Amino acid sequence: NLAPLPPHVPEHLVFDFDMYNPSNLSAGVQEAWAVLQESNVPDLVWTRCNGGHWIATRGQLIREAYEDYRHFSSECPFIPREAGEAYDFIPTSMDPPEQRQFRALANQVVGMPVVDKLENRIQELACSLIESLRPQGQCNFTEDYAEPFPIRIFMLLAGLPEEDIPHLKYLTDQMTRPDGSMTFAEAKEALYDYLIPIIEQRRQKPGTDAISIVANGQVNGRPITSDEAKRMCGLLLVGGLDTVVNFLSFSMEFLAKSPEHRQELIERPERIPAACEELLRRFSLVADGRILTSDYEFHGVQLKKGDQILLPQMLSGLDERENACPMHVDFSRQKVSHTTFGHGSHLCLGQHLARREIIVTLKEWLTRIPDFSIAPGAQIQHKSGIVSGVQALPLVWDPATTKAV
Ligand code: HEM
Ligand SMILES: CC1(C)[C@H]2CC(=O)[C@]1(C)C[C@H]2O
């Protein structure tokens, strides 16, 4: 439960927030985390939950810490410590200048050029999935669209069979929103047992898939090793299977409850990209951290070497000092400020793929199914963790109001 306060922590900086089970979760996960920004809470606090760790609450401190890799290292990015220590994914667990070489290779596989190439399949899969659901008049969005749409596209990119989805998805979820059924290390090992054989095969007989490209890539002049390949692909898996999936659900949940926002996107399509940024701001869902490389005084607070600090990317855009009326969704804000895809040297490489998948969903869904809402008597429950999610999203609609294409 609560760990004993360390000697160097002033007790007035204590605020016991549990990132895996915040108190007001019933009101929404973003709302639950936003309590960290109430006037009674200092900008930098220490929680005794999950082993004890700091949490920066303002977009300003979050950006700073993310830029200063000298004091805030990526080596142990996950909390609790045990997870941050077992964490060895590349390029994430590396600090510059080492990260740089690996980031470039990962970029080759999920960067802009790959997205432009996959565009037609993304579009195709979206239209197909939506059209197949359209006449039914109901669906559980999380499992009927949010999961298959992003995941199948990734399985297509990586060259992995759809049959492995259930297994891989389970392991991934244990890493971001631990059930308690298994430790991060055990989750990490199982994913690795899966990847190792595949990597071996693709080193011997290269294909055009992302895995073959990584497994045979060159880093710093020499060839990548199997271990380095295994660790980079491990990261790609977690990113492809547990990010866009959850985000689509928060957005769709909001849309089902706000006819005014749906209509806006239907009558003025040129707004969709702007809407996408705003939804990414309001429904930001990631929260990881860094480890202190040495004693350091950050904004008047003395941090000691070894201290882990949670720097919630989710909070930057919900900060009122950053965005006026943060909880209000406004597709016409003059400036949408956020760090949803991160900040600093570890800025999300898969952000282009994410945005394309989001915009395609919005446009294609609103075209065929303009009017829809949350099923009567359904309680939507969110879940918190390194990456937040929606448990299930029961949606209902009148088929007679849909348009086939
Ligand atoms: C819903 C969209 C997504 C969000 C919100 C998101 C968020 C993030 C965040 C916050 C980071 C920074 C982590 C840190 O600084 O410790 C990150 C890194 C990364 N993301 Fe994403 N991501 C998304 C989708 C994806 C997708 C689709 C992939 C592709 C498989 C992916 C691959 C990566 C990679 C490779 C990195 C590591 C970059 C590096 O270490 O240099 N992400 N992502
Ligand atoms: C924090 C992240 C969302 C980012 C780095 C990770 O380990 C993830 C859990 C997947 C990837 O997109």
Instruction: Kindly name the residue from 49, 236, 349, 366 that is annotated as catalytic.
Output: 349
Q: Is the CB of 238 under 6 A from ligand 2?
A: yes
Find the angle CA(361)-CA(363)-CA(364) to the nearest 5 degrees.
65
The answer to whether 66 touches 343, Cβ cutoff 8 Å, is yes
Q: What residue has token string 């446009």?
A: 363
Phi first, then psi, for residue 44 (nearest 5°) are -130, 115
Name the pairing type of β-strands 289-292 and 308-310.
antiparallel
Task: Give the burial string for 84-113 (b: 16+ CB within 10 Å, else e).
Answer: bebbbbbbbbbbeeebebbbebbeebbbee
Distances (CA, A) of 51 to 20, 24, 31, 309, 383: 12, 21, 24, 12, 20
CATH (domain of 152): 1.10.630.10
Q: Looking at ligand 2, which atom is closest to the CA of residue 346?
A: 5
Per residue, the 3-state secondary structure of 220-274, as one string, reads: CCEECCHHHHHHHHHHHHHHHHHCHHHHHHHHHHHHHCCHHHHHHHHHCHHHHHH
Residue nearest to atom 35 of ligand 1 (CA): 349
Tokens read off for 1: 């439960």
Q: How many domains does the chain have?
A: 1
Distance CA 27, CA 6 (A): 32
Tokens read off for 338: 């956020």
Instruction: Kindly name the residue from 177, 203, 271, 333 that is annotated as catalytic.
Output: 177
Question: Is 348 labelled a binding residue?
Answer: yes
- Give, for 276, the enclosing helix (H) or strand (E): helix 272-282
Q: How many CB atoms lie within 10 A of CB 272?
A: 18
Q: Which domain holds residue 320?
A: 1-405
Q: What residue has token string 């190792």?
A: 196
**Alpha helices (runs of H) in 111-225, residue ranges in sequence order:** 112-133, 141, 148-158, 165-176, 184-204, 210-215
Tokens read off for 335: 């400036």
Q: Looking at ligand 1, which atom is closest to the CA of residue 285?
A: 5
**Residue 340: nearest ligand to its CA?**
1
The answer to whether 63 touches 346, Cβ cutoff 8 Å, is no
How far is the first Cα of the chain from the last one, in angstroms, to the nearest whole number?
A: 54
- Give, for 138, the enclosing helix (H) or strand (E): strand 138-140
Distance CA 387, CA 17 (A): 16
Find the angle CA(388)-CA(389)-CA(393) to the nearest 5 degrees.
160
Mutate-to-test residue for ligand 2 from 243, 284, 340, highest number of ligand atoms within 8 A of CB = 243
Which residue type sits at 204? Q
What is the whole-number distance in angstroms between the Cα of residue 62 and the centre of ligand 2? 17
Mutate-to-test residue for ligand 2 from 62, 78, 87, 92, highest number of ligand atoms within 8 A of CB = 92
The answer to whether 131 touches 139, Cβ cutoff 8 Å, is no
